[PDB]
Amino acid sequence: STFIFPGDSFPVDPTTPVKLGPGIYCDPNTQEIRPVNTGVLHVSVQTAYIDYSSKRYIPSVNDFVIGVIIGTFSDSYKVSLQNFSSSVSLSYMAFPNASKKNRPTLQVGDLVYARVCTAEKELEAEIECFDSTTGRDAGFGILEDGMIIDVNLNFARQLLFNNDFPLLKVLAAHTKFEVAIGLNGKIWVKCEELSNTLACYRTIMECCQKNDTAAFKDIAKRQFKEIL
Amino acid sequence: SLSVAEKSYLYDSLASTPSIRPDGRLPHQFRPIEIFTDFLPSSNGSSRIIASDGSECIVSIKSKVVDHHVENELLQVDVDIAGQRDDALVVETITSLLNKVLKSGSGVDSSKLQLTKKYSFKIFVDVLVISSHSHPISLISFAIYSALNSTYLPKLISAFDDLEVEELPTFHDYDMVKLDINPPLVFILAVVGNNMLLDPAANESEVANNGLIISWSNGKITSPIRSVALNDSNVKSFKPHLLKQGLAMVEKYAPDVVRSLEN
Amino acid sequence: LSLQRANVEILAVEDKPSPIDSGIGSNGSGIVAAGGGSGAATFSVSQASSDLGETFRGIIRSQDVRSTDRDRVKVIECFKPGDIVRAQVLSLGDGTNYYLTTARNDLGVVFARAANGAGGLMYATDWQMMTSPVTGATEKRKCAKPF
Amino acid sequence: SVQAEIGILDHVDGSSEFVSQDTKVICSVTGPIEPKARQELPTQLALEIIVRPAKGVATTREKVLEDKLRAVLTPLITRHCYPRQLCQITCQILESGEDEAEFSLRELSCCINAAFLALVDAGIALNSMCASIPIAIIKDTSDIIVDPTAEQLKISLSVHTLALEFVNGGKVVKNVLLLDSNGDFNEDQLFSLLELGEQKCQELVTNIRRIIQDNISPRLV
Amino acid sequence: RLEIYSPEGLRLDGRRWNELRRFESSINTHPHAADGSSYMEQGNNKIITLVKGPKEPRLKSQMDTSKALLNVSVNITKFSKFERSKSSHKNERRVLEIQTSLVRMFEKNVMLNIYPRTVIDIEIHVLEQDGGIMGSLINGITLALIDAGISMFDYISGISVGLYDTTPLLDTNSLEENAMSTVTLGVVGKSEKLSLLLVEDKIPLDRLENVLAIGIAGAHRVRDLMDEELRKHAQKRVSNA
Amino acid sequence: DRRRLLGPAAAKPMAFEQELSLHTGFIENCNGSALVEARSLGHQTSLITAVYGPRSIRGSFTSQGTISIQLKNGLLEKYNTNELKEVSSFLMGIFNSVVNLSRYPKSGIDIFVYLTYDKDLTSQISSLIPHCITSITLALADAGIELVDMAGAGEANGTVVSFIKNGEEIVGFWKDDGDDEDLLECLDRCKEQYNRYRDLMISCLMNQE
Amino acid sequence: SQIVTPGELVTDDPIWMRGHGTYFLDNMTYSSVAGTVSRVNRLLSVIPLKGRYAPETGDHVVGRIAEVGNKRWKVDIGGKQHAVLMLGSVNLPGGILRRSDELQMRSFLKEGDLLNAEVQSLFQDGSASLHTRSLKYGKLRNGMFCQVPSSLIVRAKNHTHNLPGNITVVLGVNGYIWLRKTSQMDLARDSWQIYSDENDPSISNNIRQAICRYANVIKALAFCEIGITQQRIVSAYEASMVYSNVGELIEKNVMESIGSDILTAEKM
Amino acid sequence: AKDIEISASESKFILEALRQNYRLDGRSFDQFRDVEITFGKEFGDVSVKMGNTKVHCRISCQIAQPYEDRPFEGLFVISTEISPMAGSQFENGNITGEDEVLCSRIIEKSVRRSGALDVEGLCIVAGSKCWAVRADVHFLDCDGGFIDASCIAVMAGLMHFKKPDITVHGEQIIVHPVNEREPVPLGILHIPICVTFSFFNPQDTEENIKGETNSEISIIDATLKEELLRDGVLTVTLNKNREVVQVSKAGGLPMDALTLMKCCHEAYSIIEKITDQILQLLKEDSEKRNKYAAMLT
RNA sequence: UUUUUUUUUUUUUUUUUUUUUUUUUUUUUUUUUU
């Protein structure tokens, strides 16, 4: 609701208990609540957090991500979520109906869709290819062919969680496609023809370069006319 | 690299009375070598030595005209060993020793390098070791000895006295003069218990207690003498009577080696 | 820390500092690691043994944390990064690490801080508990016996 | 006045560009990322700082600038939020705005401001805000000049750099991060210089707040 | 002021415009020092090449699980010219460029993917140098690699062509290289495809195809000579052993 | 030089028996140290040595310790790199025979010698070798490194000989220039110097507890 | 057979199946090495003229310990890669699971030791796996080491032989040779001390002289490029008794004479 | 990490798009990127932009002593040191790596060895005093093609620079201040420009070496994504007098000679336009400065 | 017509710049068309 800076006064009554979200720090020495990020402060048993702009992903539990297999070990895979970042681990038993005879068959260089399950501060993060909380398996696994697009984190959140974001609807009015959205800043698309996939890639890149959601339709029309 | 049992067996064989060498050689016997000379046409002299275990060295000799008042040393040696850094300790130690053995007054007759009352020849010695398995001081010394006895230099045809009126030195365009300088030889010895060995092999160097470096020139022992460690896991002290024994051994058996390097 | 072992660095061998000079102030201002400055890229490898401030390294395997139930040990419930631990040498290991154990009543954590090193010091309360004095919060460790 | 721009490079986490008179610096930030094994710290974030000059290659003159920048930046960052990670910070000086053979304070102030802007743009947790100004004292007149030009530096008697720390909406001074004085001065001059510098730094930090809010707000919903 | 190309069609050393220098090569010259070796003589050039490997890597960092690592080292001695060199050439940018070019040439030809977790080392010593040294290096590397029994797709041959006003001259020496611009080529097998192309001085744009064709024909002849020598050595080796 | 301030490029440099004192343990940030100072009629020398180790070493496992010796100039740069490295190699050869290296697996020992002062009050590096040996022996004993014997040396007419076991054994021999037929006299003179140096070293170790 | 060179067309018949040393494009088969053409039914391949030793299951090899690892050893046998010796592939004097021996592996084998082993299996890339689970394998002592190229070792059913003069030879398939004094086990062929570094305290001078002579004649046979067998070794040893001094056998003419005499005697 | 990871899907997609005559950014196979050049306040300060690649250059000079061997010439040097500012895959101090050495050698051969600068005009007093000129290249953002951008920036900066006027007063010299005696420019003999080509194999190695067809693919001025998947590379330098300044193809995928000649012929059309653009921009900058100076009278 | 499920191994980067060199000389008045 308001724009805040690091070191500013926190506008919350000290008596009422509020759960803390991203961008807010509790001092371990003075037990004081202060903001450490720049952006917009949202206050909703009520929760407060700051919405700030970022490009570098930090793992958090219950996030949907897209990774690349970079190494195979005796009992697990080595997975990268972003260039120049520390790797995460994916266990051989983290697949549906997995056993010591039903081994996975992924190779170095494959794309995977997974969920973050463990993000301890003193350890290496872990991912799984099925929702263990609910037992649901909705789209988790290998992504064949297609193309990958890099975006910032706010754009990916807007695509995944906001149903009034108009990009998917305007894209569906030109072609039929498959999509997977990762909160680490990755988008995967695939169409039946390569020209349609290329047009989708160009449209998504150009729309992410801009900030106005009202110009998406014109961009899509121009890009899909360009490929003839 | 050897194991404990191998080293114990070899040391027991070598430190016996009489000594038993692994290939059955006598305490003063050398191994066969092959010598080639005059195979680099662009140099004043050259040689190549091949040892029986694969060791190989190549030497080149080149010259330049300098003012022998500003220039103090007319012989310079440069050493290159494949697989070693240019500033490695062994490379610089060998370079220092080889420059010391060929100094101005050491038995090397530097009066044969003089042209005109003002100028002289300066000799450059370049050494390249292609492959080696032990301390290559004596191999390089033998190669230098072979190369220096087949060197030819340009012949001066333009005056000799130029103290008052000086003319640029000028040389004959086809003829050359053989250099008849007197080069020395360097030997390495191994100490195994109470015995002294000439020309030790790689496996004999891994069990030796100590080593000696002795220089030789025209019938006499020459100044540069050092004690050297041929390994780091078995180096120990030795009694003074082993030094005299080594000096006598070199004095006795050096002339035979000279005849083997002739021509 | 990982799921299988803990990595440590040796600071003192029988109440004698090792090495004598820790290299403090060699990299300038701020908080820098020993090999995190400009001199780390110009160290003469072939003319010395190691660089300024380097220490011996060790490894504690999870099966060596204690002598009993050495198949259900959780490493993060025993140690945290930044703790001071007293251990005993088991083997010389390879050229990189020694092998250490804490499977005795007098071995374990002697100094620790709250909030993973951002808070104040804690004091040992039980065989498996430490307490923060300013705020009565407790954490789990493998406490070495005091007194 | 000063001109500042945010988010101008494509392959880094954050970037900025600061201009003050004839001094121009561009800075970039990448982190948190995986460090080398010899840079790692068990409980907090590690820093790698590089400064490059406008002409020639880097020498020992830039090492002092790197040292002072590291001294200023270390207490600003909430380092305990990123255990055993790395942050790379690189500053390129495009125009010195002074005679490099004698003076280096304008470059230091511009680098401090540019690095703070890039850290804000990247998304790193920060304890508070910062601002830095250069000051000089001129001969004969013995007047204290805030933001001196290159001509006024050639006839100066002492040169100073001041960097302060602000909290609570940019109205409360928390600490003095850096004061660097070189020349000849007495106590009264020093305590007048501090009083003037505090007000100038407050004005600068207010301006910086306005610029940041203008640049960042369109990116959010 | 010399007659580089006389009106009678003769060069300074007596050759004609499309003639190679004397070409002599030997194989298996250093059996005790390397797996493969060769000794190359091209005019007054003298080069020793040694091939070590495939073998265990020295460090665990230089290990690849999909293919082998290839390294090339070139040593140019201080006595390889008429005038002695003042300083060493070990760390010059020119030598590093030569080494990188050779590695990138031979990466595509050697089947490195059938020797995972190994290293192959090439060490080269240049004793005498009289022009056109890059082509001689290429030929020596090819011969030494084949002598070591390492799988490859085809031969690579090196050649140099100089352009004197309007006259192309094949396989130039030091005197010609100091008076005109030259082109160095690396040709694969008996085809028209080039692995290396190196031009360091100015050449008119409308005069390059003819030079390329002349160089390609010369490289084919060089490949023929190398193949003949290899077959003769193999016949002698298998005849008695 | 990017790491040093060397000044303008166009500048040119300006062109124009023995009594001993031994002390140990005065440097705080090392393991052992010694100061050797010798005076006579026509010479004067001062030396400082420092020992670092045993310390960690880079590489693969080694079953015994490794020794490194570094020689540095002082005040005046009177020697070049090659001769200093040759003397260092000779000293390393000597001290590989007296240190009990089997006691220190996978570790290194680094020794530094500073040539602080050398003045002629009324062939020059050979006469400096005995004092280096004495200083290194004293510093190694101060640091607590195991030695099988106390090593000394003597100098006589360009010949240096190092002894152990009361002068009945030789651990190092050096000879440059000099007379070719003079070997027994050199040995006797070097041993005579060695005995005095050994007495002084033992007294220094025993008194300064 | 037929000698081919890299890049040479071998056949254009679309009936052959391609093996090692070849590459193909459609129906054209080419050579990737210099060697000879080999045909087995419908399989076509090229055998290189030169190469390193390639281990095979069941081989008897001699190697040196290179690295001490995590429950394993690395052994150098002269191939393109090091071999692997697992801790479970050796015999331990006391036991495997006593209520150590994983952190104390250097008390049995350490860097530089020589040992006798057999190839158990090959990995995916051709590297070997070794085992020492018999009384005929283990640490080597009481003798000397020598080396010849592996292509000169004639394939046979047995590789350990007893020679006149109380000498035993172990002929490694990879070309590594061990000469030693004959023991009780060797005579019978025709617990904690198996990892001991001590030699026999009763090795006499005659045995040392015999070992020197055997090493010299083996080197002489290798110089003439004659395959090494037990019968040839004995014949060359007996024919060298003309020279009373063992040290005269290192000259080139003597070595060539010994080899030529062996060949002439065999051919007659 | 310092490794840029590429998945199999991305490689397959880009290669298949190349098979159908598609580039990700919409260019054709023989289209060069647009070039923007901006001049700073001082002489010799130039910024060059090529799509997303940004490069900055600076020129400076000072008094020095000539070499003993060559007493009639001045000194010229070019420095190109890369930093993690252009991308986290670049080390801070690395002048020995393969790509850095190759780029440095190519720039040196194109500019300094070809004699584009008149170094005999830098001599003040023969044998004792001369000028030393420096070129410093700063890499700000990498999207491919540092070599071409660096060449353009260095040449434009050299053509924009001016040095102070001096006079010889007996034994010593006098360097006049800029506000006194109108600094003077350098002499440029020719203007070289570099072009880079990238090669891709849509088949296997056997088809490339033993095949009859030549189906290799060539594109001009690759981006960062494209140049991480290429099999070969070629750089050629040319001037408007139809001279080949240098050619560099240091290994890689073998290419037929006719295709290489076609590449060399395609580069000339680009260099002509680039030369004209640089000359026009310099003329406009000079006119702007003269007009402002007149208006400030 | 009972009975018959076989599948081997590995963890966190070698240290010090750009210069990278051969075949020999001369002599006293603007501008255009010639």
GROMACS .gro file of C-alpha atoms in nm, chain B residues 11-131:
model
  121
  239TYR     CA    1   7.114  -5.186  -0.094
  240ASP     CA    2   7.220  -5.527   0.040
  241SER     CA    3   7.360  -5.612  -0.303
  242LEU     CA    4   7.544  -5.282  -0.352
  243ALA     CA    5   7.690  -5.248  -0.001
  244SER     CA    6   7.875  -5.581  -0.001
  245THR     CA    7   8.238  -5.693  -0.029
  246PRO     CA    8   8.286  -5.724  -0.323
  247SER     CA    9   8.005  -5.500  -0.450
  248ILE     CA   10   7.740  -5.648  -0.681
  249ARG     CA   11   7.578  -5.415  -0.926
  250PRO     CA   12   7.232  -5.496  -1.069
  251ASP     CA   13   7.368  -5.527  -1.426
  252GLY     CA   14   7.696  -5.690  -1.320
  253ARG     CA   15   7.926  -5.397  -1.398
  254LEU     CA   16   8.261  -5.337  -1.231
  255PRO     CA   17   8.290  -5.044  -0.987
  256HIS     CA   18   8.473  -4.834  -1.250
  257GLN     CA   19   8.300  -4.950  -1.571
  258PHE     CA   20   8.089  -4.720  -1.789
  259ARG     CA   21   7.783  -4.794  -2.004
  260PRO     CA   22   7.782  -4.769  -2.386
  261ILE     CA   23   7.692  -4.440  -2.556
  262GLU     CA   24   7.648  -4.306  -2.909
  263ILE     CA   25   7.799  -3.977  -3.029
  264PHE     CA   26   7.716  -3.766  -3.334
  265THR     CA   27   7.884  -3.438  -3.427
  266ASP     CA   28   7.843  -3.163  -3.688
  267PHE     CA   29   7.476  -3.207  -3.774
  268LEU     CA   30   7.355  -2.846  -3.732
  269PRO     CA   31   7.503  -2.658  -4.031
  270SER     CA   32   7.406  -2.315  -3.894
  271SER     CA   33   7.619  -2.356  -3.578
  272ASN     CA   34   7.994  -2.337  -3.533
  273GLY     CA   35   7.980  -2.675  -3.357
  274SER     CA   36   7.725  -2.926  -3.236
  275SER     CA   37   7.685  -3.273  -3.088
  276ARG     CA   38   7.423  -3.524  -2.977
  277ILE     CA   39   7.463  -3.796  -2.712
  278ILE     CA   40   7.226  -4.090  -2.666
  279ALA     CA   41   7.251  -4.302  -2.352
  280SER     CA   42   7.153  -4.668  -2.327
  281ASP     CA   43   6.847  -4.590  -2.111
  282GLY     CA   44   6.697  -4.330  -2.345
  283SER     CA   45   6.867  -4.016  -2.215
  284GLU     CA   46   6.950  -3.767  -2.489
  285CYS     CA   47   7.125  -3.429  -2.500
  286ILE     CA   48   7.192  -3.177  -2.779
  287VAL     CA   49   7.457  -2.902  -2.769
  288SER     CA   50   7.506  -2.601  -2.999
  289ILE     CA   51   7.804  -2.363  -3.019
  290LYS     CA   52   7.778  -2.005  -3.146
  291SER     CA   53   8.014  -1.707  -3.134
  292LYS     CA   54   8.014  -1.327  -3.140
  293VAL     CA   55   8.273  -1.048  -3.160
  294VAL     CA   56   8.300  -0.834  -2.846
  295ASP     CA   57   8.534  -0.583  -2.683
  296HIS     CA   58   8.725  -0.796  -2.434
  297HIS     CA   59   8.787  -0.503  -2.198
  298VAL     CA   60   8.418  -0.442  -2.125
  299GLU     CA   61   8.340  -0.814  -2.147
  300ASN     CA   62   8.486  -1.012  -1.857
  301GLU     CA   63   8.375  -1.370  -1.930
  302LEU     CA   64   8.409  -1.514  -2.281
  303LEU     CA   65   8.226  -1.844  -2.212
  304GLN     CA   66   7.856  -1.859  -2.126
  305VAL     CA   67   7.638  -2.167  -2.076
  306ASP     CA   68   7.258  -2.180  -2.097
  307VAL     CA   69   7.070  -2.494  -1.992
  308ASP     CA   70   6.718  -2.607  -2.084
  309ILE     CA   71   6.561  -2.925  -1.944
  310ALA     CA   72   6.229  -3.046  -2.083
  311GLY     CA   73   5.956  -3.068  -1.821
  312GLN     CA   74   6.124  -2.828  -1.576
  313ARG     CA   75   6.068  -2.459  -1.509
  314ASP     CA   76   6.331  -2.207  -1.615
  315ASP     CA   77   6.379  -2.107  -1.248
  316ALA     CA   78   6.393  -2.459  -1.103
  317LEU     CA   79   6.657  -2.520  -0.837
  318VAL     CA   80   6.835  -2.805  -1.017
  319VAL     CA   81   6.851  -2.612  -1.345
  320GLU     CA   82   7.013  -2.309  -1.183
  321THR     CA   83   7.252  -2.523  -0.977
  322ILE     CA   84   7.371  -2.703  -1.292
  323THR     CA   85   7.402  -2.371  -1.476
  324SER     CA   86   7.614  -2.225  -1.195
  325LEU     CA   87   7.842  -2.530  -1.178
  326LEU     CA   88   7.891  -2.544  -1.555
  327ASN     CA   89   7.974  -2.173  -1.571
  328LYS     CA   90   8.223  -2.221  -1.287
  329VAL     CA   91   8.401  -2.512  -1.455
  330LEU     CA   92   8.454  -2.309  -1.776
  331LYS     CA   93   8.572  -1.986  -1.611
  332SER     CA   94   8.865  -1.778  -1.735
  333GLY     CA   95   9.139  -1.946  -1.534
  334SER     CA   96   9.041  -2.310  -1.488
  335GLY     CA   97   9.255  -2.494  -1.744
  336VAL     CA   98   9.049  -2.354  -2.032
  337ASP     CA   99   9.292  -2.176  -2.268
  338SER     CA  100   9.106  -1.854  -2.347
  339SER     CA  101   9.405  -1.700  -2.527
  340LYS     CA  102   9.291  -1.880  -2.844
  341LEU     CA  103   8.978  -1.661  -2.862
  342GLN     CA  104   9.170  -1.335  -2.911
  343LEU     CA  105   9.151  -1.144  -3.239
  344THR     CA  106   9.306  -0.795  -3.261
  345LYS     CA  107   9.449  -0.619  -2.954
  346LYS     CA  108   9.099  -0.486  -2.870
  347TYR     CA  109   8.846  -0.757  -2.964
  348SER     CA  110   8.784  -1.128  -2.905
  349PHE     CA  111   8.531  -1.405  -2.964
  350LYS     CA  112   8.262  -1.477  -2.707
  351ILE     CA  113   8.131  -1.836  -2.706
  352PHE     CA  114   7.768  -1.925  -2.635
  353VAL     CA  115   7.691  -2.280  -2.520
  354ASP     CA  116   7.326  -2.388  -2.547
  355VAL     CA  117   7.218  -2.718  -2.391
  356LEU     CA  118   6.885  -2.895  -2.448
  357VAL     CA  119   6.804  -3.215  -2.257
  358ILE     CA  120   6.526  -3.409  -2.429
  359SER     CA  121   6.493  -3.699  -2.185
   0.00000   0.00000   0.00000
